[PDB]
């Protein structure tokens, strides 16, 4: 498809002769026979192009480097079309052209670092093009190597523009019929100051033909024209795209470089200068910062310094200083994205809202939100709605919280923005093999199924909040919550979901971040609800908490319980509401002793002792209050245990059951019926699973099952003893279950949790102790060689006896031989002793008995001190862990207890049979608006506090005084002029 390249582009030949040696440098011997001052084009003959094609550098390389030779006087439009379409290079999001001779093949280390870090990182983030001299020397070589390094670290493309005539091995690049393959010898031994080797890091090269055999500056005009054309081009899609930004980076130079800068500025293309680069660059920087003649002579070599044409050039540059921008090193800042944006914004001026999109996209690609707000969203420009859609999508995909907040702030309609496709893309933005990615793959967004799987399945803002939580983007999730619908319910649901995912996550550090985010959400919800309660107790308490939202169709309290958000239960409003429920219709301030006394004197309730026809109302109010039900159940449970113990210890006989035993059976059946009612009324499978999820219910089921098995066994003629044994164990289970009632008390509440946690430590210590006991017991048993050797006896002497030794029961008479009477026990050789213990073996060997005593000493030490105190240290650590939060645990237990007893029959178990037989909108809008108003007040107060923080004051005063210093310089210059 290259049959037309010669047709459009052309090559230039010296043709005419202008004087041994001529201007063009071609030897007089080799010159056209057709032949004052050399003419760039008049003394030149145009010919079809002949050096087009692709390069494949020998050795390491990409085997593809589009190289084209074209005439200097070529329209940039055709070149741009060729590059964009034929060669497949996508339209750049940015173009940077580097300038400056950079004298010396090796450049300053600071300059090299600044270039390779700042410029190349900016290009990588934005995916830009870089245009430099396609020469493997100095700044061009440095740019090429840095670009290649960042490509390997990965898109950035490097473009070469070098004169045709300073490139070595030109003849290797001449083919009229096509040069798709090509070998370029870029490491030739000979070296000359005229010809230079092409770099091998550039994806494409441009060789301007000026009809000369070697010179410099033959590409300045073409390069400037191409840059200007780029500056006036859209990023594809014809005019539907947006302007492609461009700027020129200057690093040192000479008078010719200064002229190049002046031409570029007259072309209205931004230029950036680096301080300390050297001549032609530092001089302009100093001029911008600000004797002028002295500096011109100082910062530039003596030649041309006297020439006032340099002064005129400097004045011309100053005339259009709006485009030039200096690079503040700032002690190796190596950060200038903000500088690029500042130059781009100050170089536009006119505000049409259609040419500022590219700067916005660049700002999104970077994290210069402050710059964009200061200029792009300063209000001068009229930002539309559709304008910001793409920028918002990009910011969301790249996790730009501040930027997305800014974009939404300035008149962006989320409702008209979010689309099923958009949400699908947002979810597809999951990071590589992330947990959310795994869940989505295992499970259109298809998000309902994953949520139902996690939680249990038993307005764009909500969707965005869910997405942020799933992808674990803290700032964006916080922002989305800040402008949601159901603030408190959303906060609790987010805490629940985050904790579930964290406990499910394998990262072990991502889980830490999720837990931290959950804590932040819980804190925000707690603060918001505290303010809501302070404003109006009745509204908040009654309606906000005890309401089923859309999040999971479960009251806020249920969400808090599932999330274990104890801090939520720990606040004033929740506890006041819980106490009010716990005391039912009675006054919450009634003394406990008053209630207890009234419990045993039912007539007494009709006096002033208890504070709340009237008689029946009062009676039902007293006996229906959940606290009274709790006291009655406690009394009945204690009586049940007493009856159980009585039967078990006295009235249990092989004979058929007696009256008391039948009463116990009826009582146990009643308890079973009550537990069945709890399970069946607290979606049948879902309710059953919820009921079984509570540890106390599991204990109740175990106890009742053991009781049933015991009754069945005893009733059988030949299983009386087994029945009695299992009943004893069942009684133990019931007595342990009795602990549930201690949760009502603050002091005894957390102790249950402490014991439950210490059980795990006991388990692990059991592992350790089992190992040590096996070791020591087997060793001792082998040493003693007792003659009983019966397997149960061996297990006794191996495990049981040392275990008691841990607790001070040391049977010396059964181990020491000095304490036993010697006897001729067995025919086996050696001496034997006869221990007095019943289960110590008939007679033990006394061969090496001192070793047995030594083992006893070591075991006593290790077990009785080291291991026991290791376990005790674990206990102390556990206790301390759940001691600083004792109140929180107690509050959570308070809620669980109140919920349990709020929905229980008013009668105690033994009589509860009759109760069981008896068993057999705009308001929400207003409430949510009130909640949202208080949320806004809370956020505003928090932001006000943040603004008054010391760091914020320091930042604000620093920026303000920077503005003051700028204004002071401005007024000083004004006074100087006048």
Measured CA to CA, the distance from residue 311 to residue 255 in angstroms comes to 11
700/781 with CB nearer Ca ion: 700
Cα–Cα nearest to 406, from 419, 423, 388, 427:
388
Measured CA to CA, the distance from residue 630 to residue 588 in angstroms comes to 15
- Do β-strands 821-823 and 832-834 pair in parallel, antiparallel, or remain unpaired? antiparallel
Q: Which stretch binds Ca ion (CB under 5 A): 80-88, 214-222, 692-700, 880-888?
A: 692-700
Residues in region 277-306 near Ca ion by CB under 5 A: none
Residues in region 240-259 near Ca ion by CB under 5 A: 243
391/845 with CB nearer Ca ion: 391
φ, ψ (nearest 5 deg) of residue 271: -130, 140
Measured CA to CA, the distance from residue 801 to residue 806 in angstroms comes to 9
* 3-state SS, one letter per residue, for 203-250: CEEEEEECCCCCCCCCCHHHHHHHHHHHHCCECCCHHHCCECCEEEEE
Cα–Cα distances in angstroms (integers) from residue 511 to residues 433, 506, 862, 929, in the given order: 15, 7, 38, 35
529/691 with CB nearer Ca ion: 691
> According to the annotation, is 660 in a ligand binding site?
no
Measured CA to CA, the distance from residue 97 to residue 249 in angstroms comes to 6
Cα–Cα nearest to 49, from 24, 86, 74:
74
341/586 with CB nearer Ca ion: 341
Q: Identify the sign of the CA torsion 310, 314, 320, 325.
A: positive
693/933 with CB nearer Ca ion: 693
Residue 390 as a binder of Ca ion (CB under 5 A): the answer is no
- Exposure class string for 784-819: b at 16+ Cβ within 10 A, else e: bbbeeeeeeebebbbeebbeebbeeebbeebbbbee
CB of residue 142 vs Ca ion: minimum separation in angstroms?
Answer: 28
198/340 with CB nearer Ca ion: 340
Q: Greatest CA separation found in the chain?
A: 141
- Report helix, strand and coil shares of the chain as percent, to nearest 5: 60, 5, 35
Token pair 């040419």 is at which residue? 355
CB of residue 736 vs Ca ion: minimum separation in angstroms?
Answer: 14
CB of residue 66 vs Ca ion: minimum separation in angstroms?
Answer: 28
Residue 690 as a binder of Ca ion (CB under 5 A): the answer is no
> According to the annotation, is 697 in a ligand binding site?
yes
Cα–Cα distances in angstroms (integers) from residue 427 to residues 97, 101, 447, 657, in the given order: 38, 49, 9, 67
Q: Which stretch binds Ca ion (CB under 5 A): 107-115, 204-212, 237-245, 736-744?
A: 237-245
Q: Which stretch binds Ca ion (CB under 5 A): 17-25, 93-101, 355-363, 922-930?
A: 355-363
CB of residue 357 vs Ca ion: minimum separation in angstroms?
Answer: 8
Q: With contact defined as beta carbons under 8 Å apart, do 264 and 227 qualify?
A: yes
> According to the annotation, is 869 in a ligand binding site?
no
> According to the annotation, is 675 in a ligand binding site?
yes
Residue 355 as a binder of Ca ion (CB under 5 A): the answer is yes
CB of residue 682 vs Ca ion: minimum separation in angstroms?
Answer: 9
697/793 with CB nearer Ca ion: 697
Strands of 129-132's sheet in order across: 53-54, 66-71, 204-209, 157-163, 129-132, 95-99, 246-250, 271-274, 324-327
Long-range contacts of range 337-340, CB-CB < 8 Å, 24 or more positions apart? 337/118, 337/122, 337/366, 337/368, 338/368, 338/371, 339/272, 340/122, 340/247, 340/272
316/346 with CB nearer Ca ion: 346
522/700 with CB nearer Ca ion: 700
Cα–Cα nearest to 571, from 629, 491, 515, 517:
491
Q: Which stretch binds Ca ion (CB under 5 A): 189-197, 289-297, 350-358, 362-370?
A: 350-358
> According to the annotation, is 187 in a ligand binding site?
yes
Residue 738 as a binder of Ca ion (CB under 5 A): the answer is no
> According to the annotation, is 678 in a ligand binding site?
yes
CB of residue 700 vs Ca ion: minimum separation in angstroms?
Answer: 5
CB of residue 696 vs Ca ion: minimum separation in angstroms?
Answer: 5
Rounded to 5°, angle at Cα 353 from 350 and 359: 85
Q: With contact defined as beta carbons under 8 Å apart, do 229 and 244 qualify?
A: no
> According to the annotation, is 618 in a ligand binding site?
no
CB of residue 245 vs Ca ion: minimum separation in angstroms?
Answer: 6
φ, ψ (nearest 5 deg) of residue 130: -130, 130
CB of residue 728 vs Ca ion: minimum separation in angstroms?
Answer: 22
> According to the annotation, is 952 in a ligand binding site?
no
Residue 697 as a binder of Ca ion (CB under 5 A): the answer is yes
Question: Can you state the angle between helices 556-563 and 487-504, rounded to 10 degrees?
Answer: 20
> According to the annotation, is 334 in a ligand binding site?
no
Tokens of 601: 């004197």
97/220 with CB nearer Ca ion: 97
CB of residue 701 vs Ca ion: minimum separation in angstroms?
Answer: 9
Q: Which stretch binds Ca ion (CB under 5 A): 83-91, 281-289, 351-359, 663-671?
A: 351-359
Q: Which stretch binds Ca ion (CB under 5 A): 135-143, 569-577, 651-659, 695-703?
A: 695-703
Q: Which stretch binds Ca ion (CB under 5 A): 229-237, 349-357, 448-456, 733-741?
A: 349-357
Residues in region 439-498 near Ca ion by CB under 5 A: none
345/524 with CB nearer Ca ion: 345
214/679 with CB nearer Ca ion: 679
Measured CA to CA, the distance from residue 817 to residue 532 in angstroms comes to 79
Q: With contact defined as beta carbons under 8 Å apart, do 168 and 196 qualify?
A: yes
Q: Is 960 exposed, middle or buried (0-12, 13-18, 19+ CB in 10 A)?
A: exposed
259/633 with CB nearer Ca ion: 633
Tokens of 46: 């145009």
Q: Which stretch binds Ca ion (CB under 5 A): 205-213, 400-408, 694-702, 866-874?
A: 694-702
- Interface size with Ca ion, residues (CB under 5 A): 4
213/687 with CB nearer Ca ion: 687
Q: With contact defined as beta carbons under 8 Å apart, do 118 and 335 qualify?
A: yes
Binder to Ca ion among 700, 730, 781, 814 (CB under 5 A)?
700
Q: Which stretch binds Ca ion (CB under 5 A): 325-333, 595-603, 689-697, 823-831?
A: 689-697
Q: With contact defined as beta carbons under 8 Å apart, do 524 and 969 qualify?
A: no
CB of residue 744 vs Ca ion: minimum separation in angstroms?
Answer: 16
Binding site, annotated residues: 148, 187, 198, 243, 355, 358-359, 384, 411, 675, 678, 697, 700
Binding site, annotated residues for ATP: 148, 187, 198, 384, 411
Q: Which parts of this chain interact with Ca ion (CB under 5 A)?
A: 243, 355, 697, 700
Binding site, annotated residues for Ca(2+): 243, 355, 358-359, 675, 678, 697, 700
């Amino acid at each position: 498809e290259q049959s037309w390249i010669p047709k459009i582009f052309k090559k230039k030949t010296c043709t005419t002769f202008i004087v041994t040696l001529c201007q063009c440098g071609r030897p007089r011997t080799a010159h056209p026979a057709v032949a004052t001052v050399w003419d760039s084009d008049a003394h030149t003959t145009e010919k079809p192009t002949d050096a087009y094609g692709e390069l494949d550098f020998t050795g390491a390389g990409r085997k593809h480097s589009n190289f084209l030779r074209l005439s200097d006087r070529t329209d940039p439009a055709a070149v741009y079309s060729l590059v964009t379409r034929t060669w497949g290079f996508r339209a750049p999001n940015l173009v940077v052209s580097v300038l400056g001779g950079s004298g010396g093949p090796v450049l300053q280390t600071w300059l090299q670092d600044l270039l390779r870090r700042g410029l190349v990182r900016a290009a990588q983030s934005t995916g830009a093009w870089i245009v430099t001299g396609g020469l493997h020397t100095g700044i061009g070589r440095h740019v090429g190597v840095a670009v290649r390094d960042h490509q390997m670290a990965s898109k950035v493309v490097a473009m070469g523009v070098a004169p045709w005539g300073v490139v070595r091995n030109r003849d290797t690049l001449i083919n009229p019929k096509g040069s798709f393959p090509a070998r370029y010898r870029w490491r030739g031994d000979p070296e000359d100051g005229v010809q230079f080797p092409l770099d091998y890091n550039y994806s494409a090269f441009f060789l301007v033909d000026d009809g000369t055999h070697g010179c410099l500056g033959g590409e300045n005009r073409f390069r400037l024209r191409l840059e200007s054309y780029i500056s006036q081009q859209k990023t594809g899609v014809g005019g539907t795209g947006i302007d492609i930004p461009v700027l020129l980076l200057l690093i040192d130079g000479d008078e010719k470089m200064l002229t190049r800068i002046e031409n570029a500025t007259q072309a209205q293309l931004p230029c950036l200068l680096v301080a300390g680069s050297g001549g032609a660059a530092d001089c302009l920087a100093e001029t911008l910062e600000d004797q002028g003649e002295a500096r011109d002579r100082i910062r530039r070599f003596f030649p041309k310094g006297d020439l006032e044409v340099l002064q005129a050039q400097v004045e011309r540059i100053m005339t259009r200083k709006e485009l030039l921008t200096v690079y503040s090193s700032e002690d190796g800042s190596e950060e200038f994205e903000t500088i690029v944006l500042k130059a781009l914004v100050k170089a536009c001026g006119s505000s049409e809202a259609s040419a500022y999109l590219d700067e916005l996209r660049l700002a999104v690609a970077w994290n210069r939100v402050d710059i964009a707000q200061s200029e792009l969203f300063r209000g001068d420009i009229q930002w539309r709605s559709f304008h910001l859609e793409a920028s918002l999508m990009d910011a969301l995909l790249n996790d730009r919280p501040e930027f997305v907040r800014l974009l939404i702030s300035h008149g962006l309609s989320l409702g008209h923005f979010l689309t099923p496709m958009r949400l699908a893309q947002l979810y597809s933005a999951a990071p590589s093999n992330s947990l959310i990615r795994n869940l989505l793959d295992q499970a259109p967004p298809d998000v309902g199924h994953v949520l139902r799987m996690l939680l249990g399945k038993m307005a764009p803002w909500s969707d965005l909040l869910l997405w942020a939580l799933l992808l674990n983007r803290a700032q964006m999730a916080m922002y989305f919550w800040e402008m949601g619908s159901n603030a408190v319910s959303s906060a609790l649901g987010a805490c629940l979901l985050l904790r579930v995912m964290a406990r499910l996550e394998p990262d072990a550090e991502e889980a830490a971040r999720r837990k931290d985010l959950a804590f932040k959400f819980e804190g925000m919800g707690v603060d918001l609800f505290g303010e809501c309660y302070r404003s109006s107790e009745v509204r908040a308490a009654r309606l906000l908490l005890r309401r089923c939202p859309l999040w999971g169709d479960a009251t806020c309290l249920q969400l808090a319980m599932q999330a274990d958000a104890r801090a939520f239960f720990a606040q004033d409003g929740v506890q006041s509401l819980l106490t009010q429920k716990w005391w039912g219709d009675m006054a919450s301030t009634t003394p406990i002793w008053a209630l207890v006394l009234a419990f045993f004197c039912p007539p007494l309730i009709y006096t002033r002792l208890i504070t709340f026809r009237r008689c029946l109302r009062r009676w039902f109010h007293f006996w229906g209050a959940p606290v009274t039900i709790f006291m009655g159940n406690v009394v009945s449970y204690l009586l049940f245990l007493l009856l159980f113990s009585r039967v078990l210890l006295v009235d249990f006989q092989p004979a058929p059951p007696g009256s008391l035993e039948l009463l116990l059976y009826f009582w146990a059946f009643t308890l079973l019926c009550e537990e069945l009612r709890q399970g069946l009324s607290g979606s049948l499978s879902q309710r059953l699973r919820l009921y079984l999820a509570d540890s106390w219910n599991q204990c109740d089921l175990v106890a009742l099952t053991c009781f049933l098995l015991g009754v069945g066994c005893r009733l059988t003629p030949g299983l009386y003893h087994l029945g009695r044994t299992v009943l004893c164990i069942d009684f133990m289970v019931f007595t342990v279950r009795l602990l549930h009632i201690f949760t009502v008390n603050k002091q005894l509440g957390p102790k249950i949790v402490i014991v439950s946690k210490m059980m795990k430590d006991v388990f692990f210590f059991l592992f350790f102790l089992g190992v040590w006991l096996v070791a020591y017991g087997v060793a001792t048993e082998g040493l003693l060689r007792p003659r009983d050797s019966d397997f149960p006896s061996i297990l006794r002497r191996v495990f049981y006896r040392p275990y008691l030794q841990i607790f001070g029961q040391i049977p010396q008479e059964d181990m020491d031989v000095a304490l036993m009477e010697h006897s001729n026990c067995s025919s086996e050789p050696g001496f034997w002793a006869h221990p007095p213990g019943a289960q110590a073996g008939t007679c033990v060997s006394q061969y090496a008995n001192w070793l047995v005593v030594l083992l006893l000493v070591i075991f006593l030490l290790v077990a009785n001190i080291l291991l026991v105190n290791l376990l005790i240290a674990m206990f102390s650590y556990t206790f301390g862990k759940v001691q600083g939060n004792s109140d929180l645990y107690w509050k959570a237990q308070r809620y669980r207890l109140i919920r349990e007893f709020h929905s229980r029959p008013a009668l105690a178990p033994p009589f509860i049979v009759i109760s069981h037989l008896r068993l057999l909108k705009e308001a929400e809008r207003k409430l949510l608006t009130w909640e949202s108003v208080h949320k806004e007040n809370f956020l505003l107060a928090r932001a006000r506090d943040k603004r008054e923080s010391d760091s914020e004051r320091l930042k604000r005063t620093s920026q303000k005084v920077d503005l003051a210093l700028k204004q002071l310089g401005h007024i000083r210059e004004y006074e100087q002029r006048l």
